[PDB]
Amino acid sequence: MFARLIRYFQEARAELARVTWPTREQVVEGTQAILLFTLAFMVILGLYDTVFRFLIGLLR
Amino acid sequence: MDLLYTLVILFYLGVAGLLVYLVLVQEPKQGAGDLMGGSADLFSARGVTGGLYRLTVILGVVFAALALVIGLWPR
Amino acid sequence: MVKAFWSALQIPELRQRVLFTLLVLAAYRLGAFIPTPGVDLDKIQEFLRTAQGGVFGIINLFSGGNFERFSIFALGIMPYITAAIIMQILVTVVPALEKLSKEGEEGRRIINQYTRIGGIALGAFQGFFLATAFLGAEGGRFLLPGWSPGPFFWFVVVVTQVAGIALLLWMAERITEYGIGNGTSLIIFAGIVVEWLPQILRTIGLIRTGEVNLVAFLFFLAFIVLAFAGMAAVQQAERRIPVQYARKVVGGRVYGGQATYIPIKLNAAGVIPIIFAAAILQIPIFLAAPFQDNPVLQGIANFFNPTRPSGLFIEVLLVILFTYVYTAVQFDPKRIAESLREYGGFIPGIRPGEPTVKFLEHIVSRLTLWGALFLGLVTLLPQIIQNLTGIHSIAFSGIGLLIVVGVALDTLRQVESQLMLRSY
Numbered sequence: 001m002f003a004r005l006i007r008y009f010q011e012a013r014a015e016l017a018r019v020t021w022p023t024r025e026q027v028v029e030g031t032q033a034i035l036l037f038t039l040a041f042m043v044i045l046g047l048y049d050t051v052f053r054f055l056i057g058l059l060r
Numbered sequence: 061m062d063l064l065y066t067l068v069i070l071f072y073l074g075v076a077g078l079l080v081y082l083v084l085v086q087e088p089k090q091g092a093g094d095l096m097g098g099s100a101d102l103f104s105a106r107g108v109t110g111g112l113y114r115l116t117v118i119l120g121v122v123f124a125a126l127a128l129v130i131g132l133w134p135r
Numbered sequence: 136m137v138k139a140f141w142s143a144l145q146i147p148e149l150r151q152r153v154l155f156t157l158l159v160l161a162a163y164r165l166g167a168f169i170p171t172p173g174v175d176l177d178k179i180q181e182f183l184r185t186a187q188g189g190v191f192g193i194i195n196l197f198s199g200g201n202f203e204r205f206s207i208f209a210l211g212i213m214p215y216i217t218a219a220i221i222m223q224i225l226v227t228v229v230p231a232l233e234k235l236s237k238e239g240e241e242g243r244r245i246i247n248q249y250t251r252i253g254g255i256a257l258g259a260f261q262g263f264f265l266a267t268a269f270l271g272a273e274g275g276r277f278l279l280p281g282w283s284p285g286p287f288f289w290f291v292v293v294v295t296q297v298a299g300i301a302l303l304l305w306m307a308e309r310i311t312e313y314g315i316g317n318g319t320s321l322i323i324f325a326g327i328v329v330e331w332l333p334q335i336l337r338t339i340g341l342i343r344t345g346e347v348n349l350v351a352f353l354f355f356l357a358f359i360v361l362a363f364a365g366m367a368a369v370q371q372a373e374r375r376i377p378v379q380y381a382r383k384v385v386g387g388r389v390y391g392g393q394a395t396y397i398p399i400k401l402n403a404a405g406v407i408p409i410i411f412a413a414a415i416l417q418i419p420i421f422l423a424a425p426f427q428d429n430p431v432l433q434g435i436a437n438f439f440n441p442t443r444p445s446g447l448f449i450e451v452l453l454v455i456l457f458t459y460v461y462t463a464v465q466f467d468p469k470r471i472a473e474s475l476r477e478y479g480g481f482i483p484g485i486r487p488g489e490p491t492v493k494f495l496e497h498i499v500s501r502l503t504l505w506g507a508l509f510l511g512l513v514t515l516l517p518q519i520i521q522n523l524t525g526i527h528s529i530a531f532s533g534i535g536l537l538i539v540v541g542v543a544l545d546t547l548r549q550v551e552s553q554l555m556l557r558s559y
């Protein structure tokens with residue numbers, strides 16, 4: 001029923017109000033970590049397909 | 061080049077099927093979860109399936125090289 | 136978890152894991168340059184840059200750019216995944232397979248083996264289907280000089296793809312076993328992020344040239360950082376449920392020790408539901424798009440196009456739904472209550488037993504909705520940003536970001552959680 005979900009929404013909203021958000025250092029930490037990871041694999045894979053296409057291009 | 065090409069193709073197929081067999085046989089040591097990173101503390105690296113490990117690598121290279129061979133094959 | 140990042144490159148064991156992972160990913164990327172015999176890659180790339188080819192975008196993205204070059208792993212690790220989904224469905228539909236899944240030691244092994252076999256078989260089927268419906272279609276459109284649309288070519292393609300995805304599944308499992316993080320997830324991850332840096336360089340070149348203004352680019356970049364930071368924050372967020380230990384009965388009344396809490400994440404750790412949602416979205420496109428001469432099938436396929444409004448909406452729904460369901464399954468209130476029970480703990484004001492499970496289930500079911508909705512927001516916004524900035528990239532789509540951040544966070548989380556156990 002519509003009342004069931006319109007109640008569920010309110011209760012879920014109440015539970016949202018009781019959410020403990022992380023500290024600033026935690027968010028900075030996580031973001032820096034994600035950036036390092038992603039950038040690392042970007043560079044590494046970059047060297048991979050670079051060297052690969054350069055060698056294959058050398059073979060012609 | 062009928063017989064020769066046919067033999068190359070048969071080798072390709074054989075390496076393929078054998079590779080399938082080897083991969084299917086090497087069943088992963090499972091846990092509770094379907095897919096995890098696993099405990100990366102233990103060095104592990106037992107003999108377990110080393111011969112088939114090296115064999116699969118070799119057959120992977122052979123399969124790749126055979127794909128390149130069939131690709132480079134004349135009209 | 137940055138400490139985990141640096142230690143994973145500092146600690147000999149973990150750096151061995153890293154080097155092995157990088158070696159395998161190198162083998163995969165190299166494998167992307169080994170073409171399927173008889174296939175004209177130039178015509179494929181040419182078609183993929185046309186309007187009708189655009190719908191294949193996501194299919195290519197999750198193939199690791201392999202479909203673009205139609206390599207030995209033409210569809211990437213995606214067939215396996217598809218099988219997995221199917222298996223899961225069966226497990227939740229067929230009671231016998233559910234029993235087999237709950238038997239314990241063996242059964243999950245049997246289900247997994249069925250998943251692998253089914254994965255290989257699926258790669259066979261998909262190889263055949265693509266060979267006959269798309270490659271050799273339209274009078275052998277994407278064929279090479281000297282090749283004709285027949286059973287020989289179909290046979291070749293099938294063999295290539297079977298052996299290909301066999302080798303790739305093997306490689307994934309070996310990453311899982313001898314490397315960091317999860318193999319499949321890292322293969323998809325690599326297949327996505329391999330395209331990022333060259334696109335960045337190209338776009339920057341376009342800014343220098345003048346085809347892209349600096350403001351739109353800065354908004355794009357800032358939005359990416361915002362995405363990372365947001366997902367990080369929400370992943371770090373938790374709902375604390377007050378509990379107590381050292382419970383003693385005094386004067387006929389229950390007392391407890393110092394008040395503590397149990398943390399419950401908004402979302403359960405795992406990029407898997409995102410993978411499943413993506414694949415599910417990819418199925419109708421895969422079945423319909425190859426038939427280029429059928430406006431109906433092209434309509435059906437373009438309906439699920441993640442770039443188009445309909446397909447994007449569907450994708451958002453799939454992500455939210457799959458995330459919520461997965462989080463519901465992972466956060467089982469029974470095992471949590473029993474874990475609180477074995478440690479001699481309780482919830483102040485709530486009687487031990489089924490009412491405790493009711494309390495937990497209520498809180499969790501009301502809570503995880505927001506995490507699901509957030510992942511849906513991350514699924515939605517980037518497409519709008521690309522539409523407004525004029526900088527389009529399926530690799531930087533909401534789904535792609537979800538994959539990258541998901542895998543990164545998962546790998547780092549596991550590494551950290553394990554090195555923590557090593558230290559103590």
Ligand SMILES: CCCCCCCC/C=C\CCCCCCCC(=O)OC[C@H](O)CO
């Ligand atoms: C699940 C599988 C679904 C399969 C879906 C097939 C889609 C067919 C659509 C167009 C083909 C048009 C060409 C049809 C070729 C047969 C010739 C024909 O049209 O036969 C009509 C018949 O003569 C009248 O009495």
